[PDB]
Structure formats: C-alpha cells, structure tokens
C-alpha cells in the first residue's frame, strides 16, 4: 500500500513521486534494543512472500559472524527450503502481476498449488506463513517422517501444471501486446540505479550471487539461471518462470543428494540442546538457561552479507558490540532498490503501464521500509 | 549453467507462415485455452464443506495458549519468568508470590492476545511444558475486552481439555 | 475426476493435457499420518574423549580487523578478485 | 572548501523535534553504572550511562499495569568518556547532573598475613 | 577549525532568504485554506504562521537559520502541492486541548508535573 | 556480428582500430599527467599490456576469450569511462598528500 | 577446527590487501583508513571532502569499476564529535567484490550529495536527510519521504526514543484526527542483558 | 472514597480520571458528544440503551481500551435501572422525542422518566446528578413539550434537590434540528428574537461544571452571544447556504434572559460565535 | 469419512440441533466439536 | 469450594476478590467472571506421602523428558517430609 503523485501530460505522464513510508514500522531501532534470537522474527518478516531466505540470510549473517560452519543436512535442508521459498515468491509475483493485469483464474490456479505448499510449512514447524525455524546454528527441530515423498509429489503434479500455466499464458497474444514495449532498461541504468537480482538478469549481464560467491552448497549442483537479452518486461517475465523451473531442478537434485548428519551445530554453548540431555544433564541445563534468558554473546565488528531473495540481493549489515545485543542492524533491501528508479523506468509511458511497471519488480511494501 | 530463452526467428517457410496466419485469422489458441477451460470445468471441484468438514492440520499446531497441570496435582507453572523473557512482544506478564505452603507460585500471568504473534518461544522456553500452544483456533471475538487473557481463563482452557494437549505432546514430544 | 467419459473427452478435447492423470485433487499419496516415532541422530559432538571444547571455540576465533594507511617501483594496481569470467550458454534447451 | 567557519556553539534542540516541555522539564543524569552487588565483575563498568530521571506510573485500571506519560522513560545511551557526555548533553540542550567514576580501592592483603603470630590479623577458622 | 556553512556569510542573507519565505508563506495560506475546504479564519492562520516564525527568533547561529529555511521550504512544497492532507494541516494547529497552563498550583492539583 | 547479447549496445564493425586510438587517447590524457606518482605507473602498464594484447591479435572470439571485458564492446565503453576519469584527474590532484586527520577516536569499532 | 566452521580464502585477503594498498597509494589525499576484516571485503575510511573525487575514480579507471550502487545509512554513533557514518556501499559489476566506503560526518556539516555521478543515490539522500538530518547542498529536491509529513524529529537518531512523541486518535469534537502526547498502555520494558565476563579475549580495548 | 477513583496523572486515553458516570441517553447528539469529552477527559461512562446495539456500535470506540461500558434499561423497571446506578459516582439525565410516540406521550417521559430514577438514585446514594432541561420550558401555554418539562423541573428540584438542573438554549451544531428543518424549507416569515449557542460550549461547560465541585445545587443557563431575530437569521442561513408544527411553534414561542440563574461567566469557558461554527457547519450545498 | 473425494473433502461433520440449547439447526457455529473430533477432522490423523 | 465475600461474587485462588465501593463489580454486570473451579492447595493432600526406604532420593516427575528436570532431595528433617520444589508431592524414609 502506498501513494503516488503522478504528475502527467494526459493519457501519458511527466513526473511521479512515490511517497512510500506508509507501512513503516520501525524495525531497526526494535532490534536495536533487543537480543539477536528474540529480534529474528523481525527479520522474517519485513519481507513476508519470500519468508525462509531472510531467515537463511540472517542466520548465516551470524554463522559468518561466529565463524561457526552448520552440519552439512542442515545446510542441504537449508537448501530444498529456500528453493520452496523461491519457488513460491516467483509464483506468488507472477499471480498478483496476473491480478492486477486483469487475468482472473491463473491467480487462483497457483495459489492452490501454495495451499499446499503452507500445508508444506505447517507440517515442517506449525506455522502456515512466518515460521522461524531456521536459527543461527543451524535448522532446529528438524522435518518429520514421511515430508520428503510428499515434496516428491509435488515436484512431480507442479511441474505438471506450471506447463499448464504456459499452456494458458506466455503467447497469449494481447497479454504480450500489453507488456512488451514497456520497461527498458540500460546497462548503465541497471548500475547506477543500484538494480538487484532479476532486473539484473534481465537487462544483459550475467549475474548471480548464488553462482558467483556460494554462500552455502548451491556449488555442487547443477543448474542454469536464465539470462535476459532485450531487457524488457516480457523477457523479465519468462526468466521468473525459467528460474521457477531451475528451482524445480535444484530440489530434484537435493532430493537425490540428501546426507544424513545432524540438525543442529554440536556447539551448545550456540545452538541450545535437545531435550533428553536437557532433563539429565547439568551443563545442558545450564546452557539452556542462560542462553535462552540472555542470549550468547557476539564478539565485536560489523560485518555484511548478502544472498540471493527472488526479488534480488537481500543484504544484512551486522554492527555487533561484544554483547548479546546487536549494536545496529541494517537491510539492503531490493524492493527499495528496485522503487529507485521509478522515474527513468516510467518516463515514457502511461498510468497502466506504470501499473504493470510496479507489477513487473516484484512488490512486497514491507521490505521497501526499513 | 545458463538455458535462456526467445531466440528464435518466424520461419520464412510457407507453411509455418501462412499457419501463424491461419493463427491470426482464425481465433485457434484462444479456443485452445477455451478446451483446457473446459476440462478443468469438467472435473469435480475440490471444496470442503466449512462448518462440517475441518480442514487438515499438522500435531503441532500454534493455537490457543492453553495450560496443563500434573496428575492429579497443582498448576504445572512456577513463573519462572522464562516465557516473559522470550516473548517477542512482551504479551507475557507474570508476577510471581508463593502461597501458604511454601512452593513457589505466582500471582498473575497475562497474554495479550493482541501482541501475541504465535511463534512458539514460550512453548520451547517452558522447562515445565507449563504453557502449550493450543490445538484450537476459534477466538471470533466480539469485544476487545475480552481478549486480555487472565491466568484463571488460561487455567480454565486447560481445563476444558487436556486429551487433545497430551495426545499431541505424547505423540510429539520426541522431535522438539 | 470421478466423472464419466463423455465429459473427460471434452476436458482432453479443450486441453490435450491428460488432465484425468493428474489433477491437484490428492487421493491416494495423502502421507499416511500417525507415523511411528522417530529417533533423531545426534551429530559430530557427543564424542566423549576428544571433545575439547578450547579447539571450536569459534566465538573466540574473531580477530580484531587489521588496519593499514591510518590518521597517523612498487608493483601493484592489482584488482580487489580475478576478473570474473563470462558464463556459457546451458546445453539444457537455450535460446537459441 | 575551507569556507565560513566559526568557532562557536551548538544548538541542534531547536531541529530534534522533542518538544520544550520534555526539553526543559526533564533533567539527565551522567554515570558509570554500578556493579549489581552480588555478583563480583565489572565488565559492566567502563561505560558512561546517560539516563532520565524516573516520573509517574499510575494503575492501568483494567490489568493491573504500569502506564506511563513518558516516552523518554526508557532511554538510556551507555558512552565511553565523560566529556564526550557532557559535551553531547549540552549539544542537546537539556540539563545534566555528572556523578564521578569510583574504581574499587587496591588493597594490601597476603595469606602469610592470614597467618600471623602476634599481629591480630588471624584466620580464625581454618 | 574549519566549517563550510550552508548558504550563509553573515545574517544579512539569513534575514534576506526568511524574509523572502515568510513572503512564500503568507502568499500560501489562503490558497490552501481555500483549497483543502478548511474552517479556519485567514487571520488566525496568518497570527498562528508568525507565531511559529517569532518562537525560533532566539537562534544567532547562521548555519541553523539556513537549515531551518530549507525545511520551512521543504514543508512549504508539501503543503503547496496536495501531498499533504487535511490531517497534516490540522495538526499544524491546535484545537483539540491540550488545556495545559504553566501555573505552579494547577501543577500541583494534577500533581507531579514539575 | 550479429545481435550481441546486450540490449541497449549493437554491434561495432571495426573494433580493432577504434579501440586502439582509444587507447593512444588514454596514453595521450596520462602523457598530461605529472610523473612521481605511481598512478601514472599503473595505469601506463595495465594500458600498453592491453595494448599488446590487442596488437598481437587481429582476431574476434580469440581476442574476446584471451582478453577480459566480454564480449567486446564492453571493453569499448569502459575505454570510454577510462578517459572520463582520465578528464576528470587532470583535476581534483588524487595523488597529493592527505588533507586533515580524524579525531582517531572515530575508526575504533568497539565503543 | 574444520568441521562446523566456516573457512577462509586467504588469497582473496592477499588480493584485496594489495588493492587497497594500491588505492591508498594513488589517492592520498583523503585516505585515512583502508581495513579488511577476515573474510575478505574491504573497507575505505574517508574524509568528507574526497567525496565526488574518490566516487568519480572509483566508477571508473578500468581497474575498479564497481557501477553497483548500494546502501547509504550514517550509523549514529555518539561519544564522537563527528556523529553520523555516511556508508557507500559499492559492488563491482565487472571484479564480483564489495567495498564500503565509510567517510564521517558531523551534525551539522554536508558531505557533498553523491546524486551528480550516482543517480540511484537520490532517493537514499532524501532518506537519510528525513531519518536523520544530514544535510545534502547541490541536491535537486530534499522531501520527507519514510515520514509523516506533520511528524519532525528525525526519528532513527538515538535521541529519538522508541515510541514517537505525538500519537493519533480520532475524536468526535472536531470531527476529526489529532495528535497528543504519548499514553502508552504497557512499559516496553527493559532488559538488562548486557552480561559481564568478556566474551571476546581479542577485542579488548585498552582501559585507562 | 476507594482508590481509582482520584485522579491519576495527565488526561487522555485512559488516563485513570475523577468521574464515573452513569449517563441516560446518550445515543443522541448532546450526551454523544459529553461522551466524546469525557472520553477525552478520560472518564468511565456507563451508559445503558434501549435500541440496537449497532447506534452503540458506532458510538463505541470514542473510549478507550474498554473504559466505556454499555448495558440495557427501560422505561417501566426500577430493577434494570437500579442495577445501572449500582455504583456510579456520577448521573446525568438526558431524554426526549419531540414527537409524541404510540407509547409515549410528551407526559410521562419528562415526568415519569426522573421520578424513577431519581427515586433509586436518593436511595443508592448518588452525588452531581445533572438534570438538563429546556430553557423557559413554564406551566403556560402552547406546548405539552414545555409543560411536561416544567412539571420535570419541578420534580428534579423536590425530590433530590441538589440536583444541578441545566438548561441551554436551543444549540446547533453539526446535527441540529432547527438548522436542519432551515436547509429543510418548503414558505413562512414571522418575527421572534433569538440567541443560539453552539453545541461544544454546552458541552464543555457540562463536563466543567461536573468535574468541579462547590458548585452544586444551583440550576444554570447558558446564553448565545448574538441574541437577534429569527428572520435575518434565516435570511443568513440562505445567504451562508448559497441557495435562495410542533418545532416551528416551538421555536417561535419564547426566547428570554433570566436575571436569576447564573450562566458561563461562573464557570470560565469561551463563548464560540454563531457565525464561525454557523460558516464551519454549512457545508452541502450546490458544489 | 468418504474415500472417493479429494483431500479436503473427505471428513465432513453434521451439526444436530440444541447441543447446548441456541437452536442450531441453523446458524452453525465452528467449534461445536470435542477436541479429539478437533484432531480428527482438521486432517492431523488418518485414524478416527 | 470457593468463598462467597460480602460483595457477593466468586473468590478466587489468589486472595484478589473486591471491596464494595468498586466499579469493577459493575463492568462485571452481563457476562460472568469464568475462574477455574478445581484449585491448587487441596490437590496437595489427595496425593499420598510416598514413604521410599532409601536416604537421598530421587524426583523426576512422571516420564522421561515430560516434566520438570531431575532433582535429588534429602530426608534428614526425621520428622518433616521432604518436597520437591518443582513436584509439590512429598517423600518419606523407612529405614
Ligand atoms: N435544541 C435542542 O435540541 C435542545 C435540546 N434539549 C434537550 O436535550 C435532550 C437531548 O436532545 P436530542 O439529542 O436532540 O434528542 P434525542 O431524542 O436524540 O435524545 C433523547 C435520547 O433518549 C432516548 N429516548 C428518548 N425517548 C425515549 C424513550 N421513550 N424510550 C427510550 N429512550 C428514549 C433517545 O433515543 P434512543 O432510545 O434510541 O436512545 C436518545 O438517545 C432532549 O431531552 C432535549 O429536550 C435542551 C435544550 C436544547
Ligand atoms: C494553519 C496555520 C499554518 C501553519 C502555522 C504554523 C506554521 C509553522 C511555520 C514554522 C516556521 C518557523 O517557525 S521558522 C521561525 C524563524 N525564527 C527566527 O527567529 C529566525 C531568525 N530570525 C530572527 O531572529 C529575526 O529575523 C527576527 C527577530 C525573527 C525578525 O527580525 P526583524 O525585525 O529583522
Ligand atoms: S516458562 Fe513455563 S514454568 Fe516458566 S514462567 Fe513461563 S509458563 Fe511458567
Ligand atoms: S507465542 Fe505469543 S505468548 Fe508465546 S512468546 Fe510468542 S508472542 Fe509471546
Ligand atoms: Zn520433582
């Protein structure tokens, strides 16, 4: 939700300021003056469609930190989830640029395929959308027997009806009438307006934090990011799905090379134990109290990083006393970076058009605050 | 790895052209989307009938914010303030007496449950597994008053069942 | 589903898709629930006899960041990384 | 480029927006914060609290809470040396009371000195 | 010790750029009083606008007059467009009390306010 | 060649000679540059190392899979930013000693 | 030591040691600082006069091209005289790497409005000028955007607490909203838990 | 008195304040805005009604976190209306249709509505209970109205006789009658003098004169500052508007001073004008 | 219960009329359940 | 097995019921103050004093991590039974 003052020659345009800070909610002073395992959530949710990457983003912020590696199912874990996670942010994009379009059924079509996807998420943690599950130290309370088949399944049915969604779209012809000749953008624009992720695969370079810098063990499988050419809107729309479709490979692949090794680190002075040491144990006892009631401490500097949201480079800044507080918490966020350069993507064009230019960068409004 | 796509060019032959032409005068695909609109018409829809059918959870779901107590015994809680030092929104309030006897005990134990976000902290920080998430999640409620829980409508939520909260956590209580 | 044939060759004549095969209605791979209990493993700690907690100690581990040129014939202009190189085109169906 | 400047004062109470009621009403208090006497460490001195005074915290006649007209009530900016406070107090404007910093006292003690043979300093017990 | 002031070199160009925005303001006033359907007098704006012109005459520093103009500019754009509401405008008076006197015994009945 | 993969950039038909009075344009701007400064030192060897990647090769795909900057008319525009910087350091003296210091208890982390 | 914890490369740390020597060297003018941490991204501590300079050569120069433009923020840090921490975060399009430059900056005096050779900068000013107050001369337009128009305070400064000053309700009086003094209905309460015992034997600082 | 009921800091949103009050009515316009201002005093009204909960519905959120509260009563029990006032520090009795009903005459509510209260009230013990009345409602003529209401008057002051009876004159505002039924025109041209006084001036010399004790057992009048005739202020409710038999009788019956009683002077509040709030308020005309 | 429908369709409940007196033959409340029927029918089981 | 105050009303199992002078009571009025019916003290004597012929014994509480965590409690007191802090059951010794 937000306002535009458009200010325009008729049926076309001159000018637009977003006003944006509508749904500002002061999210940086809050965990400024929390702990780091009480304030993730924070973090989960200023960006809210993708919802499992900011978790993997802030918890290997930490992990970077401490200089603590996770056990190896837990980064595999960590993996075939942010794949869900991109999967379903790509689709949830493509539906509500359908929506907002026109284009009524396509919506609801992929959005029963998310049904089952949060039923996913409800049988991982309990939570239907923002479940935190992913601590620093590793994914806790690790998947029940009897999922892996289940996301075989829909492996299997969504491939199935994402060719069906490019049975009914994608050569729709006054679809493609309606954006095609919208949304240029330059190299040098695609630079100096500071674009992230898609609008970078998009328009000409080849770009991936994934593949450049592997955060994680994105490495060792095998996939291939579609890459833009003409830089336009329509272009943009068939890499989203093309990268839905690498994210189907990617979770084939995980499924296929799954180890497994242990869901949490095996530092408890970090991650806190399970319960059968914690019922006998004293040093688990211990280690459960303090570190639930003040937080571990973390060892001075600041630090940034950055991985790959669907919308683009998410970014978390880290400015750490030697505390249990964090000192300053700040977020690249690219639904910010991508309502940057409203003007020059909009100077041309009409009041529809703007509309799909709005639609076509991915828009959540609360990872825009920060 | 890279698989892009839109290289291509329109075939100069005769036939793939005067096909996109028989495309574009003839109205083809449009009626193709018509078909596959009408198969997805002619399946049965997949509805369920809300107040008789319920529609399927997990053993683990986040609801209520009930409490338990032991067999046959006292309140299974003895505020020791770890949920209020958790709670990611502070709807926690305890203040904490002991009675007559000697054990320790509280006095009040408050959720808000308009800052209650649901994680599931006070249900992983409870040493005692005092507070549980609740199975059920009807609340619907008509006036504002009535959602400030005290701890004697938590106790008498834990009173109109334990069975469901047992059998989960009995079912349950092996992952977490 | 649970139709009759008439009509399930018209939704294959409207979308020749064999929408009777799959049809996001779950009947049969509804994960079987009431699973029996598992039994987490327990990873590379635990390991009585060698686990000095001293080795990962990857809290202490953070160094204090070293500094150069401050407020108090040289073979160089090198970049930050290697220069990164250009990717390929995937053999997996590109365009063109 | 090496323009203006003059060597003057600061007075940025008239753009921090906090109205003049909380400006001059409202008084702060500089210092080192004390160590919570049962436990025995002072990794919790070294740093320089700047707080406000406390003011009315009536019944919420509802739940039985605190509630309070104050918003900078739960302010508190840990510093590292005095002038440094001081100098951002009268930034600020708004005034300040300084408590001194108090380290804990080197004392002589030795266990030979524990165990004496006509000096009164003796163990007693073990 | 060196400082780059904004705009100013002395105060005569501080009295030169409010002098001119408290020109753009009061040719701003009846504008948006005419043009937000507002219920105000002309007379109590204008008395209201100087008012807060006289509360920040105690300032000699150059450089807060400059930046002090730049944001009377900045509000005087917000308000000259129709990007700000009637709400903003409102706020910017005072007609829901707020009773609050500076006597010392009225402060002494609704105690511990000093 | 033939439609590069870029978007807003078509394709040049003699690469070899513009680029290499691009770069005598380079050496030109550093011959205005003044010498103690090693910036000058830099930019002169990585220049006449590029240049003697170009000259050596009257090439296209080898001279694009040798020479960094792909494909090709990246490293045309980035020539172009080059001699911008190269304009805009004539001026603004990078290489002269350091204006005034910190207070030095700023850099600092820890507070 | 190597299962569980994350290793290093200390080829990029070598790399990027020795471009930021080379940096420091060629442009001495506003180089104060030039760290790197220990996983390799490179920092650049900066006077606030070198601004246009030192962004002018770092677009180009064909050894650091760096055109990503990214965040922005002025970490408010206080027992400083130069408060706020202008942080340009720059990512190299054609050399995959990132370097901050921090350069510092006081209350009261402007850096020098990097929006002439980074046109995504402009919508970072206008925030960081509504945030905090640091003013931006040789700038197109300076607005209050992320804020309330009405609201001034410029809230994510430490002086600024947690809840605002003003807070809205409807009233039936005159019809419409108004602002009062803040009533909150809880305390946000206020956890000390700044344990003691020195978590980190590495960063210590010297005490007097 | 117990605690929480004295004062509790500043004002404002539940801010623990002085009064608890009982009010009748209130769904109205005068006893809508009293509980306007005492919400913003920060008082807990308890007020019943006798409609559909959705008038209280969209008069329910004037209060705080559940600080007003909402109950029912009736016209003929004293049980529910006793069980209103079980505790209450403060009452105030605002009532009446200008129109006789089926079940209600203008006898009976102005007469039979006080004496039930006011009976259960002297015998659960209630102080500064404010009874309004019309002004110069007498035993004389051409008004059953305000004839009824004198019989009330008379009543309210016997029986409990330190009752404050307060009458205003009659008040416009945003939901008048007598302003609506001038937009609410066809013609007819008579002559009578008259002064009208805002409605939020009535409104907060009531919250005023409630809050502040020692002034108790004297009936109050409050006085419009214009105080001229009905016919040039219809022409300036035309003129302002752009646009060229019981309330008519009713208000070209009797508009006086009374030299006895004591008005706002004793009380301290700002008298608005007709013609700012009367400039405010006439809005919906032609564009 | 009835197999041949698809997820979501398989267990269905029918209210009866005044379990605590409301007349809810109409106006069907949620919740009308016991809490074992509240684990069987929001699909955590697959045994009744 | 509550206590009726003179206010009239249902006390509770934390002595916090009302005085008269109260408008509580009266935002009490429509809907009823619903309080647990099955307190805490009197579940404490329906549990028999175990009587353990060892010396230092053992409370866990009803089940391998369900519960309160393991506590060893004394029975020196000869004639005051020892009680577990979490429990609130007792234990004895037959020597
Ligand atoms: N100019 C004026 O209008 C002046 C008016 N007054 C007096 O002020 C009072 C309020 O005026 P106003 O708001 O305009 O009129 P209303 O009719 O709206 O106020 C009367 C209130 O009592 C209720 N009520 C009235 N009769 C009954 C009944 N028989 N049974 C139950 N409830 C009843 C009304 O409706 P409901 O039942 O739906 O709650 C309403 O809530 C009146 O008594 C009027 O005489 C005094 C001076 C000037
Ligand atoms: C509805 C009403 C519209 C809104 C009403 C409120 C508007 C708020 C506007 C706020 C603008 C201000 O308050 S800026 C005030 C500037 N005050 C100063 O003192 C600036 C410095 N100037 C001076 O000291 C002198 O110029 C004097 C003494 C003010 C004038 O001297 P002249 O005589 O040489
Ligand atoms: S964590 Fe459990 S036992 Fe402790 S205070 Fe909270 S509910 Fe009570
Ligand atoms: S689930 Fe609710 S009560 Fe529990 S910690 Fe979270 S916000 Fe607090
Ligand atoms: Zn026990």
Redesign the interface.
Known sequence: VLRLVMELSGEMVRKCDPHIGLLHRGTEKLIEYKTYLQALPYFDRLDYVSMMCNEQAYSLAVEKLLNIQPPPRAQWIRVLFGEITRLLNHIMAVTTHALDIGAMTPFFWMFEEREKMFEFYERVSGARMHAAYVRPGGVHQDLPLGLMDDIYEFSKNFSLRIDELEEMLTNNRIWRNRTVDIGVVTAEDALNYGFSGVMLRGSGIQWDLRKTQPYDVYDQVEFDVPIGSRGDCYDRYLCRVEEMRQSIRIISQCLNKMPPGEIKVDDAKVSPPKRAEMKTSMESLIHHFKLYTEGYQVPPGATYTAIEAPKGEFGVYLVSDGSSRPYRCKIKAPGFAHLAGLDKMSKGHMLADVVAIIGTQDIVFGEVDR | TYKYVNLREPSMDMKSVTDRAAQTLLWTELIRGLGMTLSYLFREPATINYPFEKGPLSPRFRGEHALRRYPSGEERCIACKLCEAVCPAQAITIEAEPRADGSRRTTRYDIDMTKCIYCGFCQEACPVDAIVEGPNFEFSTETHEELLYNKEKLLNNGDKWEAEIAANIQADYLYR | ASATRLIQGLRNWASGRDLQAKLQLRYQEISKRTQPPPKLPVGPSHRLSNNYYCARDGRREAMPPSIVMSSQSEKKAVSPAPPIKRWELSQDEPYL | ????????????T??????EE?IK?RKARIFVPARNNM?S????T?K?KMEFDT???????????????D??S????????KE??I??AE??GWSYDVEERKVPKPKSKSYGANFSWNKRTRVSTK | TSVKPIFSRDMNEAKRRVRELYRAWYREVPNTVHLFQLDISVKQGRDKVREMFKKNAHVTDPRVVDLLVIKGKMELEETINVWKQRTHVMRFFHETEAPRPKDFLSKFYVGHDP | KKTTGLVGLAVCETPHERLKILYTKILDVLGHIPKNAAYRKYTEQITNEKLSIVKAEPDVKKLEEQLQGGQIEEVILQAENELSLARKMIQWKPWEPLVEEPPASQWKWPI | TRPTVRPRNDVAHKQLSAFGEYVAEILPKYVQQVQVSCFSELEICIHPDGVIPVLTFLRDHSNAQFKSLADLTAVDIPTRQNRFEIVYNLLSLRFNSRIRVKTYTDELTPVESSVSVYKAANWYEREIWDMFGVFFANHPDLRRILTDYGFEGHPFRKDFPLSGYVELRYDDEVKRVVAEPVELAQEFRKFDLNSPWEAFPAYRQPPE | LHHAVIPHGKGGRSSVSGIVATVFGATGFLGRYLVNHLGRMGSQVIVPYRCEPYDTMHLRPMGDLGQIIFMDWNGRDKDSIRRAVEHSNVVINLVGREWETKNFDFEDVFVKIPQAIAQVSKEAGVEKFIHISHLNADIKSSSKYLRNKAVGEKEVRETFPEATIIKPADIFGREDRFLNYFANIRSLGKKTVKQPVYIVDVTKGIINAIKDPDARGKTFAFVGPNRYLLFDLVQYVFAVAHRPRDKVERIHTTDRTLPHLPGLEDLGVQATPLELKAIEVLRRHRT | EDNKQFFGRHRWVIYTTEMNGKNTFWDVDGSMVPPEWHRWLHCMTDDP | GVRTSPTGEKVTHTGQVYDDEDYRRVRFVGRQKEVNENFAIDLIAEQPVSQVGSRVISCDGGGGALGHPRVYINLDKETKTGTCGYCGLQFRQQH
């Open positions: 480029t090496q323009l203006i400047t003059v060597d003057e004062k600061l007075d940025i008239t753009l921090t927006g906090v109205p909380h009403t436990q460490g002072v990794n919790n070294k320089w003011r009315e915290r009536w019944e919420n006649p509802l739940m039985g809470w605190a509630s309070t007209a918003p900078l739960n302010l508190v900016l840990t510093f590292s040396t440094d406070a100098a951002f930034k600020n």
